[PDB]
């Protein structure tokens, strides 16, 4: 039985939210989103194994007009990060893609399409940041959901 | 006095000139006998003869010496005559030295003198500033020799012309930090006696002119960077203020600005380092002391966690103005105070230039128009005004020197000089600017010397061209008061020019060479396309096909209002410009969209256009999203919203303004994501501010909603304020108006707890917005209790209550009821800023009777400190009464009509 190498891309989105003027929960675009560290330091990650799985680790903090985020989202403010289907012809949402190259990047620079990381509030999906993906299609590197 | 002897005339004789000073002085920061602060010193001034006389005259102010009085030594070579007496004239602040014998040219002489003076807190000369930190009274020693007041520190030739070199030393408490114009020579050395004192010696300055001198002994610290050229930059503030990046911004931008000016002057920064210190009280905004520039704290420091964007602009544009002086003013100093207008006026223009380089994205440059041009135009448009150039022989007394600091010799100065730099095409202006600097580096100049060097530059070039000489063109603007109103009959193409006063009927008496005519540089635009260019000659009438139109076609003069003049058109072109503004308003540049509003109202005031016309120039605002045009409408409109705000017309007017704003409020609501993220562009932020403020004060539901919801959120959890400093002023001053004592009492609590002056000021004003009569009257009571409100802020608070239409009669009765008690006790109080701001609304024959009475009633106990403020308040009423009886019916009908939907 041949040994394969599987990577779990633990991408962690640190959401940030604040109570609107009308008391609504609106997701700030200042929410951090960090990728697994590689040779460089973050801002870009390239899957360099046989197959990989994508796991999204969502936190959440709130802030006042001072954009400083300490206290955690109590609620109407509580929300968790979702990676919406952006401008790419594929998504993570369970349902077995296969690429010849797959890279996640925070920079829009050198990019194919992008995913929309959004805050899933109660009754609302607000896009916060974008997840750029650099992909070249093939059949060498697989993508296992879950 | 009886002038016939060179010590009864206010000017230093041309007999002897200073070469260099050796100056040592020692500040005692702890009270003395009788509890008196003292500084000691000793100067060695070295002058040079230029013409023989038996008398020596230096400046000296409020200084004791050693009961001879001065020692005179001849630099080796010299023969030293002897000293007869040694008088002191306390009027023309001179130290007079009488001699037995005489002295001749070429030979330099040295004068030694040791002394001491009161280190008072008059914020003048060598002085002390007491500041409360924690709950301790700290005390530091600082300087402020502006105009005079160097004499108040040591005997010297205190005129801006007689530049010299300075060796400075400060003997100070061992652990405090000594600062001056130049870096410290070495490290601070223990004093011979009292080894609890150190001695800090400074490197010799360039050739400056006193009054730029600065020395500071304080407990301060600094943040610093070093620019890629060796120059050291340091921001000095109180130790705590330094802890949090309070001085960070004022360092962030100091470098970039310092570069810009180096380039814009084609001259390198003339000193080793640049210290800017933040003093806590310091009155006069700032001081451009060479190498060590003093700022008031609110002006230099910035707290991102308690300051508005408004506060950021103030910092950048004042560092800019002051660093600007580091070349133009100190490196090349104007000869006398009569030409102050050039110095300050210039820096008042380049403020924006430097500033703009620091914050490229803000578009400062423009702000000069409403913040400076139209501002000064309001005061330059009355017979009371004066011209910038005043003859030197007419400036002598330290008082006359001070009155050289008008808003004219500042804003006009800037406008004038801005227009100059504009019709000579920048690049060319900088060339003359530079040749001027290099030419006169380290020496005095008149304003003619700059006019020359600008010619020297236009003469050396064939590309651009003017009608007459540079000095000829400038004289029209510098030698006579006021400005013209350029009138255009677009049907014919004719053109008029006329002295513009807003009081149609005026006794203009200041006789003028030139007959109030100007050589006017007139840019223009036709259908968005920029026309060629024209010059109005010093002639009343003229013509050109630049200013002629077809059926459907509009012209528009003074683009970006780079021309110190106002344009009026025929009643058809206006209407054409209006229609343009209605549809695609992007065609007309934003500063002109402002101009059309500013001008038409000033015209309406002068009776040159119907009041209704200026009104139609606001109908285009429903599609406007930018600060400047709106700001124009508000400014000019708020006199209406003050004559008619207790009247039958406030109804529709309030309705009309709601109509114009809603779409703007809507835009920002969306653009700002339900008020959760302020726009980025400074001017866009400025717009959101006015957007809301107007929406609320005019009764727009969602705005009132926003304000309430936010305030509720705040009391729901104090000590954690959810309201962005940008919005606080408006949100407070509405939530309180929209609620009862729950909120008022809360705000009052936050007020007393507040320790930052910004907030305090916002709250204090907001508190006056409650529509509850009893709450206002209660607030009026608190007003006279120094335990709760500061007497300095008392008058401010009172008529801030009178601003409230409900509080109007309250404050009026209060003021005229408590008048006795006031004077009789609290009698600096600003007794005049009060009576003005209270009677500010009086516009009925009856209200005049009341005012006339208050005068008669409280007559036996006069008013002083204002009186002309009461008499002049009685004036502004007549004006108001008349303006209302005329304008009411028309204004009413206009607002009524343009409110329907
Ligand atoms: C994004 O991450 C940064 C930290 O890298 C957070 O900013 C810092 O947050 C701490 C408190 O959590 C503050 O004490 C620091 O002063 C902050 N530093 C900066 C650069 O501002 C920020 O809170 C994170 N955003 C979210 C939404 O969690
Ligand atoms: C009038 O002033 C406006 C600003 O209100 C100028 O518009 C800017 O022009 C600069 C160059 O001077 C450009 O770099 C900017 O992109 C423009 N700013 C904005 C926000 O549009 C304009 O140059 C001036 N117009 C004339 C005809 O002199
Ligand atoms: C001040 O110091 C310089 C040396 O740096 C010296 O040349 C000059 O003569 C001094 N001035 C006086 C008044 O001694
Ligand atoms: C002035 O001070 C310098 C050193 O700072 C000293 O060398 C010189 O002797 C002084 N000049 C006079 C006139 O005392
Ligand atoms: C200066 O002399 C006066 C006498 O006129 C004296 O009252 C005062 O204390 C002295 N001032 C200082 C600051 O020493
Ligand atoms: C002022 O500058 C002039 C040159 O314009 C120079 O000749 C003169 O010596 C200077 N006068 C003084 C008092 O410094
Ligand atoms: C600094 O030194 C003086 C005595 O030289 C002392 O009175 C003062 O308290 C000291 N300041 C600090 C902050 O320790
Ligand atoms: C000044 O610039 C630095 C980076 O150069 C930045 O980190 C800091 O936030 C800025 N300071 C302020 C007050 O904006
Ligand atoms: C001033 O700038 C010009 C270029 O515009 C340069 O040639 C010249 O050397 C500069 N002068 C100085 C003193 O740096
Ligand atoms: C409106 O005018 C501006 C220039 O003034 C132009 O850029 C824009 O395309 C025009 N918009 C429309 C809708 O015609
Ligand atoms: C912003 O406020 C409006 C009006 O209250 C609302 O319709 C909209 O949903 C809000 N936007 C959000 C919640 O992001
Ligand atoms: Zn200045």
Author numbering:
A (entry chain E): 283 to 377, 380 to 430
B (entry chain A): 61 to 127, 130 to 889, 892 to 965
Task: Copy the relevant paper text.
The cell surface aminopeptidase N (APN), a membranebound metalloprotease target for cancer therapy, is a major cell entry receptor for coronaviruses (CoVs), agents that cause important respiratory and enteric diseases. In some CoVs, the virus envelope spike glycoprotein (S) mediates attachment of the virus particles to the host APN protein and cell entry, which is blocked by antibodies that prevent CoV infections. We determined crystal structures of the PRCV RBD in complex with the pAPN ectodomain, and the TGEV RBD in complex with the neutralizing monoclonal antibody (mAb) 1AF10. The RBD adopts a β-barrel fold, with a distinct protruding tip engaged in pAPN recognition.
Crystals were obtained only with a mixture of a PRCV S protein (S3H) and the pAPN. Using these crystals, we determined the structure of the PRCV RBD-pAPN complex by molecular replacement using previously solved structures of the TGEV RBD shown in Figure 2 (97% sequence identity) and of the pAPN ectodomain. The asymmetric unit of the crystals contained two macromolecular RBD-pAPN complexes. Each pAPN molecule was engaged by the tip of a single PRCV RBD molecule, which bears two exposed aromatic residues (Tyr and Trp) (in red), and they bound to a membrane-distal region of the pAPN ectodomain. The pAPN crystallized in complex with the PRCV RBD had an open conformation, in which domain IV was ∼20–25 Å from domains I and II; this creates a central cavity in which the zinc ion at the catalytic site is highly accessible. The virus-receptor interaction buried ∼870 Å2 of the virus protein, 60% of which corresponded to the β1–β2 region and 30% to the β3–β4 turn. The Tyr side chain (Tyr528 in TGEV), which protrudes at the β-turn in PRCV and TGEV RBDs, is almost fully buried in the complex, locating between the first N-acetyl glucosamine (NAG7361) linked to pAPN Asn736, the end of helix α19, and the first half of helix α21. The unique RBD Trp571 residue, which protrudes at the turn, docked in a pAPN cavity formed by the coils that precede helices α22 in domain IV and α5 in domain II.
